[PDB]
Write a protein that binds this ligand. Structure first.
Ligand code: CLA
Ligand code: CLA
Ligand code: CLA
Ligand code: CLA
Ligand code: CLA
Ligand code: CLA
Ligand code: CLA
Ligand code: CLA
Ligand code: CLA
Ligand code: BCR
Ligand code: SF4
Lengths: 732, 160, 30, 41, 142, 63, 80, 87, 34
């Protein structure tokens, strides 16, 4: 029983593949040998605890480095002219120009400038000194230690929970909606009201004076007497400076809307009310399902009773409760689908409605924070679709799902794949033809001959929000609508002042280039959805190979016969759609960074004239913003962007190195390693050294994964460098 | 509409007409006035002046960039930007789709159906390329009679 | 700014956390 | 012409003759009616 | 069928030496010996790479893989009318006769061999993997 | 056995390339014990390039 | 190592055995076809997994089927 | 070339460059090396003090190094470079 | 910076010693015959 011990079939492999696949089949717990239901769910539960401990031990070190090597107090004194320091650098390979050039933010040595928005976050939430961040780091060290204790505890046989506890979906949803989403957002509200609002108003509220510092002039009297408007009585004025007592109000739960006029960020009183609202509604929504007390819902009978009587949905959702509850890949795919749609809702709502103080002014931090959640969301959504494919191979029972909606997806799967194919082809011919046409017209000396389409649907939606720039004047931009008159005394005085401003990123002025790149975005989502729906629905089998389910999920191919069956598996469709999410989110974040990099220095006409054709994208965005990127180090000297100039070139290595695994395939390298094995076995003084693992080439799935991971690492490092060097070196 | 001035009264659209002829007039300064390459630039200037006087007379909308923008919502002023040439397109594109569909039905009932697609039967092709003129009356006519779509019992379907 | 002795408190509490991470990894093995 | 016109009716020749006529037509539309961004009819 | 015994006295084809021959897998794991009877002195393509003069009598060739024995064996079954057999030799000294097992080649049917690895159903009647979760059996071996 | 020689049948076998496709029967084996006696010829080849396949009478209907 | 399975759709055309480069397949007597023979895989531990038998099988869908499972030094095709 | 009496000679188990000379040094040189390298013999013992001794010897000269010895302990020797937008 | 010398200690151990601890202990572990 060698490594890997979870799979007996890989332990008898005498090659290097045994070393490789044991790393990659390490967390695929259900594919293990001598493996049961209880061990599956308990190992997944303790792996969740280890994941929670890693997240909290990560946050602890991102708090410890700000408290220890970062100037959080100096950034708190002046958040506009001080660069936030992540951590100090101890590199033995620096020369004296590198030590003298990485010393930023008034530090004593070479430090890294934090582009993660942790200073803006911790400032808005109430943390002011380094001692508060250190106490938070020790507290989250304790929390991660408690989660390690709980992870070890639930693997002990006294505290092992059974699968019936794990598959209790009603109790899990009630205690998740009530506890995880309700009492934590009500806990939050208690922080935002007790700590963050008085620290925005200058009052230092800590644990020593928690029971004495009253958050309102009349606290908990008007709450229980019903007059809640006392908590919205005296809001913060427009002369309020953040962190100071002057210009401040006393109301803890306002409904002002819009932005704080000095930080260009959301009001802590609004976010406190926001959390009291997504706390009351989640504790009320957490009393829905039936657990132990007679009242509630059984979701099995909800899904059984939700059948349309015309038969257009077949049996409806009958048999889907056992389908989700028995399949961990269905629950994980649903969780990652929801998580991608909310990690992208995170990205879309922290740039346009900045929630943290002095985050809108720090431009490259905002750029990093958008690109972060759009790449983490384009890998979470692809993981959702890949887990739908793994559900259809190793977890979907056609007998249990008989003529329900999930079986009817397989019944008309060629219609879904062909219509996603039509939509992708439509968007591709139209977007490419219009961009290439606008390229030809700028090439042929005639900018007026472009097909420029004003995006009047989304401009109509912006005028429906309150933008008076386009002059549609339908609702919330005209005073004759009932929605405006229902809102003009309640939230719209903040919202209209925030949306009619042209310096912020709240619902920006869009044009024909925005139309064209939104069809690029629709092309990217549609073609990624095409490959992923095609992988998920041809997961069990297809007309080329009907027994794809009996070959597992991530099998390489089926041989050169029947024309050729390369990339036939559903993992290979996931593999081909990782390139499409990289291209999609590359287009998304190209559009974001160029729409904002022209907004921040003022000349939005550069984007309005140049984004309609791809030579403007190549020249005015990829070439123009890379001026101080690749000049980070020269023969003459090196700048502070030099690490971002190396990380850019580094990306062009790793990405191109992926091509070595994605173009060249196995048997060339297998014969090459055969010649290498002969050469080592015949070389004098080196033949004495043996291998225990037989040297083989990388296997076919492993080759696609290694090329895909290299492609992804190079792709995220070329853009992390360019994006954090073409905004942080030319601020604006 | 959508914050766009008309191109006949747009100062940016008239600026692009001024700086395009001036680019071509400076190209004309290094040639003889009766020379053959100077007649091409003189024809280019008259092609440019015809273009700018055509864009302003069609009620095109020009933005702050001085460029004509198309309104594709279906505006009664803006029918010839998307709706009128879209219906012209879909008639021509449906003509391509109807005579290629009717050719495949005409060669499926043949002795060698695969030799009539590499070697396209031009008397069979040209007698239905004329018939693709009236194709909305023949596509919805086949849709109402059920001949447009095939029933799913006779369609090759990959297994679940 | 934090002090010298507070770094000692953090390093012990991370070493205690590193033991509890080592204890879970032994139990995840078994 | 029992076989010469069969070669002339093949897929690459008929694609060359149609797209030669098609690009020949669309160029000649773009001479007498150039810079056409809006259909007036 | 009595299996043939490896004589270990028949000589090798006249070969100048190759670098594609026996590596250390021959020394510690296995190597394959193919024995065949020849009409005359011919020249054949070596499956390790090269050409050798094969003898006028019985020949012995040492190969590293079982695929090298069939690639040689099907070469001297189609180009030449030569019956062949090969063996599997282990480093302890045991010679395991491998092909043909019944004495007649597996393309031709023999009554002595039995059906093993044969399913009485088709591919479309194989069971789904969702109803065979957490078992040693899989969708095809039952 | 079989429907008829020279008849038009439709394949009900899920894993065949010619599922829900019109095929022409060229041979039915009347020997007992044969699982798939009906030999059906198709106008279109599969990915292997062949058009000849053997099916049981339970996997075909007359169309 | 690799598991090669023969199904009852086989017609006994023998070309799966003829395409086999490691002598896995053999033709045993059978009563379910005109040729009165079906393939079998007794030496399936010698299978490299190349699926030359699946490329040479004329039955739709395939009668010989190779499932890539645990891979050893037989099924990796090494000489060292 | 197959023998069935000598299985190693017919498979490639050859000492191609080996020698069967028993000794070529003297007793004075041999007794010096086994005395000094006697505490370095056992693999489990040698792996313990090489990890523990190797961790100390990189932390010593990492910390006792000077400004001219290593530039990261020298620190900045000029005015800091101010970035754009006053940052 | 509070303690400037812990950069000079932990970056050599977690950068050089700890991979030399982890990769050597894994290479023993992945090549155990057991
Ligand atoms: C909560 C999120 C989550 C969870 C825990 C799962 C859970 C799992 N996934 Mg998944 N997946 C998700 C999201 C996640 N994944 C995302 C984000 C992606 C997109 C990148 C995928 C893409 C992916 C594929 C398509 C595969 C898995 C598979 C697996 C298994 C782990 C395989 C393993 O050890 O990999 C170890 C991986 C490495 C050592 C490579 C990491 C190297 C980095 C990238 C550099 C396990 C069932 C496999 C499975 O179930 O097999 C049938 C499978 O084939 N997943
Ligand atoms: C995962 C979280 C995280 C990450 C990314 C890092 C990253 C860094 N740390 Mg560390 N740090 C962490 C946790 C974190 N820290 C916490 C929680 C503590 C508080 C006790 C420390 C205390 C600390 C010190 C005292 C020093 C660093 C230093 C450094 C740098 C060099 C690596 C090193 O020597 O590690 C040293 C690591 C430790 C002493 C403890 C690490 C414990 C973490 C939680 C293990 C996480 C494992 C992970 C989940 C597995 C994947 C690097 C920038 C050095 C520095 O500033 O460079 C100039 C240095 O001097 N760290
Ligand atoms: C009130 C009771 C209670 C509460 C607090 C929880 C709490 C939790 N359970 Mg649990 N559970 C309970 C009872 C409870 N459960 C019951 C009764 C059942 C029995 C059936 C279960 C059975 C159950 C299972 C079997 C599993 C859980 C798991 C978990 C964890 C979820 C994963 C996680 O941490 O994500 C944290 C998620 C959130 C905090 C919600 C955030 C929502 C979105 C995604 C984000 C929105 C937040 C906001 C925008 C972000 C701003 C922050 C940003 C500034 C940084 C969490 C600790 C899993 C786990 O991790 O195990 C250790 C697990 O395996 N539980
Ligand atoms: C789970 C959330 C949470 C928790 C732990 C607390 C905890 C506390 N709150 Mg509090 N608070 C929260 C929610 C929270 N708050 C929210 C939802 C609001 C907004 C309406 C406030 C606004 C509020 C006021 C205005 C006051 C407190 C006060 C109190 C204190 C005593 C409460 C009492 O007498 O009963 C205690 C520190 C009272 C006090 O004495 O604090 C100093 C006080 O009068 N709370
Ligand atoms: C002036 C330039 C022009 C050109 C070069 C293209 C190019 C293309 N278009 Mg497009 N398009 C244009 C104008 C243009 N479009 C306009 C103005 C409209 C608005 C009505 C559209 C809307 C559009 C539709 C609705 C469709 C096309 C389709 C097509 C493609 C295949 C058409 C075909 O062969 O028929 C193939 C045979 C058919 C029956 C399809 C035609 C659609 C029927 C009539 C409905 C082709 C690459 C297709 C496409 O890109 O999607 C894949 C398609 O579905 N285009
Ligand atoms: C510039 C490079 C580029 C181009 C245009 C193609 C072309 C296209 N991709 Mg993509 N893709 C690319 C690179 C690119 N891709 C790379 C790097 C990979 C990663 C391995 C893939 C892998 C791939 C897969 C996996 C899928 C696509 C699909 C397709 C089509 C998308 C539908 C569409 O846009 O039709 C419009 C056509 C064009 C824009 C091409 C214009 C060429 C003109 C007509 C020449 C005259 C189209 C043929 C999907 C598909 O074909 O389904 C419909 C499909 O599922 N792509
Ligand atoms: C004979 C005419 C004919 C007909 C009526 C259609 C009609 C159909 N095809 Mg298309 N197609 C054809 C030719 C035809 N095609 C040929 C020649 C090819 C190879 C280029 C394809 C390749 C193809 C793809 C790749 C896709 C379609 C799809 C579609 C649908 C929407 C139209 C579309 O996507 O734009 C047309 C798409 C093109 C790629 C343009 C090809 C049209 C050529 C220029 C017409 C040639 C005809 C002429 C006589 C020769 C529709 C069912 C989609 C589908 O699955 O259905 C929803 C889809 O994904 N077709
Ligand atoms: C589907 C995409 C698409 C669409 C909608 C159009 C449609 C148009 N283009 Mg075209 N164009 C495209 C792709 C596209 N183009 C591509 C791919 C190329 C590069 C080969 C060009 C290069 C091009 C030339 C060079 C010309 C057109 C012109 C035109 C017009 C044709 C007028 C006429 O009667 O003929 C019309 C506005 C002509 C025009 O009037 O310009 C406005 C003209 O000058 N276009
Ligand atoms: C975080 C990782 C890490 C760290 C701390 C260092 C540290 C160092 N690198 Mg190194 N390096 C690493 C990763 C690492 N490297 C990797 C990943 C790459 C591959 C791309 C390189 C490639 C590289 C090369 C090519 C060279 C350096 C050199 C240097 C030295 C530059 C400082 C100097 O001028 O000393 C000057 C030199 C000294 C003061 C000599 C000290 C040598 C000590 C005494 C060794 C003592 C025994 C040792 C500790 C045993 C280790 C046991 C084990 C547990 C780790 C320094 C020792 C240079 C050097 O001089 O190497 C020594 C050099 O030539 N690095
Ligand atoms: C295959 C599969 C799978 C998966 C799938 C996926 C992944 C999907 C996705 C999907 C998605 C991811 C979707 C999403 C969606 C969303 C939506 C659909 C939204 C909508 C919204 C709305 C409708 C709202 C409304 C509104 C508006 C619009 C405005 C105003 C406001 C309001 C609110 C009113 C699973 C796992 C299950 C398993 C099985 C198989
Ligand atoms: S081994 Fe490679 S080339 Fe051969 S069929 Fe599989 S994927 Fe295709």
């Amino acid at each position: 029983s060698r490594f890997p011990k979870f799979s007996r079939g890989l332990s008898q492999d005498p090659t290097t593949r045994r070393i490789w696949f044991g790393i990659a089949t390490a967390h695929d717990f259900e594919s293990h040998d001598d493996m049961t239901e209880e061990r599956l769910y308990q190992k997944i539960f303790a792996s969740h605890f280890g994941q929670l401990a890693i997240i909290f031990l990560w946050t602890s070190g991102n708090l410890f480095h700000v408290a220890w090597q970062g100037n959080f107090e100096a950034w708190g004194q002046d958040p506009l002219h001080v660069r936030p320091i992540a951590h100090a650098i101890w590199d033995p390979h620096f020369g004296q120009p590198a030590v003298e050039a990485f010393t930023r933010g008034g530090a004593s040595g070479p430090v890294n400038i934090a582009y993660s928005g942790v200073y803006q976050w911790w400032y808005t939430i109430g943390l002011r000194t380094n001692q508060d961040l250190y106490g938070g780091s020790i507290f989250l060290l304790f929390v991660s230690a408690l989660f390690l204790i709980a992870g070890w505890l639930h693997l002990q046989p006294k505290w092992k929970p059974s699968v019936s506890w794990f598959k209790n979906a009603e109790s899990r949803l009630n205690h998740h909606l009530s506890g995880l989403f309700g009492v934590s957002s009500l806990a939050w509200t208690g922080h935002l009201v007790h700590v963050a609002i008085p620290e925005s108003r200058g009052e230092h509220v800590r644990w020593n004076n928690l029971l004495t510092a009253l958050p309102h002039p009349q606290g908990l009297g008007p709450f229980f007497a019903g007059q809640w408007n006392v908590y919205a009585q005296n809001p913060d004025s427009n002369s309020h400076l953040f962190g100071t007592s002057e210009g401040a109000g006393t109301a803890i739960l306002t409904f002002l809307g819009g932005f704080h006029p000095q930080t260009q960020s959301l009001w802590l009183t609004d976010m406190a009310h926001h959390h009291l609202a997504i706390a009351v509604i989640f504790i009320i929504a957490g009393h829905m399902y039936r657990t132990n007390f007679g009242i509630g819902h059984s979701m099995k009978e909800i899904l059984e009773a939700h059948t349309p009587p015309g038969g257009r949905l077949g049996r409806g959702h009958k048999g889907l409760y056992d389908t989700i509850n028995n399949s961990l890949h269905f629950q994980l795919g649903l969780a990652l689908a929801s998580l991608g749609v909310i990690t992208s809702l995170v990205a879309q709502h922290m740039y346009s409605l900045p929630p943290y103080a002095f985050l809108a002014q720090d431009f490259t931090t905002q750029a990093a924070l958008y690109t972060h959640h759009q790449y983490i969301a384009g890998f979470i959504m692809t993981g959702a679709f890949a887990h739908g494919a793994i559900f259809f191979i190793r977890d979907y029972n056609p007998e249990q799902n008989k003529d329900n909606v999930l079986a009817r997806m397989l019944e008309h799967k060629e219609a879904i794949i062909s219509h996603l194919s039509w939509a992708s082809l439509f968007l591709g011919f139209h977007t490419l033809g219009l961009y290439v046409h606008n390229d030809v017209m700028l090439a042929f000396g005639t900018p007026e001959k472009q097909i420029l389409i004003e995006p009047v649907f989304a401009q109509w939606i912006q005028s429906a929000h309150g933008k008076a720039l386009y002059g549609f004047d339908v609702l919330l931009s005209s005073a004759d609508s009932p929605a405006f008159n229902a809102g003009q005394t309640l939230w719209l005085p903040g919202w209209l002042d925030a949306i009619n401003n042209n310096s912020n990123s709240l619902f920006l002025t869009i044009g024909p280039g925005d139309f064209l790149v939104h069809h690029a975005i629709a092309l990217g989502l549609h073609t990624t959805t095409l490959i992923l729906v095609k992988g998920a629905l041809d997961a069990r089998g297809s007309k080329l190979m009907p027994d794809k389910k009996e070959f597992g999920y991530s099998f390489p191919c089926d041989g050169p016969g029947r024309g050729g069956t390369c990339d036939i598996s559903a993992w290979d469709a996931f593999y081909l759609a990782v390139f499409w999410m990289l291209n999609t989110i590359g287009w998304v974040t190209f559009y974001w960074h160029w729409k904002h990099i022209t907004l921040w220095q003022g000349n939005v006409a550069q984007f309005n004239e140049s984004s309609t054709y791809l030579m403007g994208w190549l020249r005015d965005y990829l070439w123009l913003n890379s001026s101080q990127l690749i000049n980070g180090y020269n023969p003459f000297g090196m700048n502070s962007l030099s690490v971002w100039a190396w990380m850019f070139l580094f990306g062009h290595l790793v990405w191109a190195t992926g091509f070595m695994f994605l173009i060249s395939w196995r048997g060339y390298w297998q014969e090459l390693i055969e010649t290498l094995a002969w050469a080592h076995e015949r070389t004098p003084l080196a033949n004495l050294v043996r291998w225990k693992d037989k040297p083989v080439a990388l296997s076919i799935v492993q080759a696609r994964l290694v090329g895909l991971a290299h492609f992804s690492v190079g792709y995220i490092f070329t853009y992390a460098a360019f994006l954090i060097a073409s905004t942080s070196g030319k601020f604006g | 509409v959508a914050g766009l001035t008309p191109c006949k009264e747009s100062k940016g659209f008239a600026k692009r007409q001024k700086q395009e002829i001036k680019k071509l007039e400076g190209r004309l300064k290094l040639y003889a006035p009766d020379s053959a390459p100077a007649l091409a630039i003189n024809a280019t200037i008259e092609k440019t002046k015809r273009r700018f006087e055509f864009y302003g007379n069609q009620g095109l909308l020009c933005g702050t960039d001085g460029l004509p923008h198309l309104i594709v919502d279906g505006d009664q002023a803006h029918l010839g930007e998307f709706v009128y040439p879209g219906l012209v397109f879909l008639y021509i594109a449906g003509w391509i789709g109807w005579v290629g569909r009717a050719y495949l039905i005409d060669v499926r009932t043949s002795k060698k159906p695969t030799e009539k697609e590499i070697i396209i039967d031009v008397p069979l092709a040209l007698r239905i390329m004329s018939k693709g003129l009236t194709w909305p009356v023949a596509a919805i006519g086949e849709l109402r009679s059920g001949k447009l779509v095939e029933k799913s019992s006779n369609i090759t379907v990959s297994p679940r | 700014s934090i002090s010298d002795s507070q770094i000692i408190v953090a390093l012990v509490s991370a070493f205690i956390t590193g033991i509890l991470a080592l204890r879970l990894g032994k139990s995840l093995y078994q | 012409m029992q076989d010469v016109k069969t070669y002339l009716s093949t897929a690459p020749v008929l694609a060359t003759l149609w797209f030669g006529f098609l690009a020949g037509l669309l160029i000649e539309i773009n001479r007498f009616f150039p810079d056409a961004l809006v259909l007036p009819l | 069928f009595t299996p043939p015994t490896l004589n270990a006295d028949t000589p090798a084809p006249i070969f100048g030496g190759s670098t594609g021959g026996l590596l250390r897998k021959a020394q510690v794991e296995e190597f394959y010996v193919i024995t065949w009877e020849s009409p005359k002195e011919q020249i054949f393509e070596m499956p390790t790479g090269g050409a050798a003069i094969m003898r006028s009598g019985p020949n012995l060739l040492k190969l590293a893989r079982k695929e090298q024995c069939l690639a040689l064996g099907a070469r001297l079954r189609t180009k030449f009318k030569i019956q062949y057999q090969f063996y599997r030799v282990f480093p302890n000294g045991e010679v395991q006769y491998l092909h043909p097992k019944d004495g007649v080649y597996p393309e031709k049917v023999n009554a002595g061999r039995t059906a093993v690895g044969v399913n009485n159903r088709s591919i479309g009647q194989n069971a789904n993997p969702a109803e065979l979760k957490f078992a040693h059996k899989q969708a095809y071996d039952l | 056995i079989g429907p008829k020689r020279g008849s038009i049948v439709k394949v009900l076998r899920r894993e065949s390339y010619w599922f829900n496709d019109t095929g022409k029967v060229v041979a039915v084996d009347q020997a007992p014990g044969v699982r798939y006696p009906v030999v059906v010829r198709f106008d279109k080849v599969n990915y292997a390039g062949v058009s000849t396949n053997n099916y049981s009478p339970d996997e075909l209907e007359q169309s | 190592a690799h598991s090669v399975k023969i199904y009852d759709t086989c017609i006994g055309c023998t070309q799966c055995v003829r395409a086999c480069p490691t002598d896995v397949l053999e033709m045993v007597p059978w009563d379910g076809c005109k040729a009165s023979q079906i393939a079998s895989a007794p030496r399936t531990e010698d299978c490299v997994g190349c699926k030359r038998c699946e490329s040479a099988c004329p039955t739709d869908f395939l009668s010989v089927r190779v499932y890539l499972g645990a891979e050893t030094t037989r099924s990796m095709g090494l000489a060292y | 070339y197959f023998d069935l009496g000598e299985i190693d000679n017919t498979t490639g188990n050859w000492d191609l460059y080996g020698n069967d000379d028993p000794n070529r040094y003297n007793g004075f040189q041999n007794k010096f090396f086994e005395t000094f390298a006697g505490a370095f013999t056992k693999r489990g013992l040698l792996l313990k003090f090489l990890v523990l001794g190797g961790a100390t010897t990189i932390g010593y000269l990492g910390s006792t190094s000077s400004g001219d010895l290593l530039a990261i302990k020298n620190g900045p020797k000029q005015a800091p470079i101010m970035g754009p937008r006053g940052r | 910076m509070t303690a400037s010398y812990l950069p000079s200690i932990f970056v050599p151990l977690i950068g050089l010693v700890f991979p030399a601890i982890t990769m050597a202990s894994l290479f023993i572990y992945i090549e155990q015959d057991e």
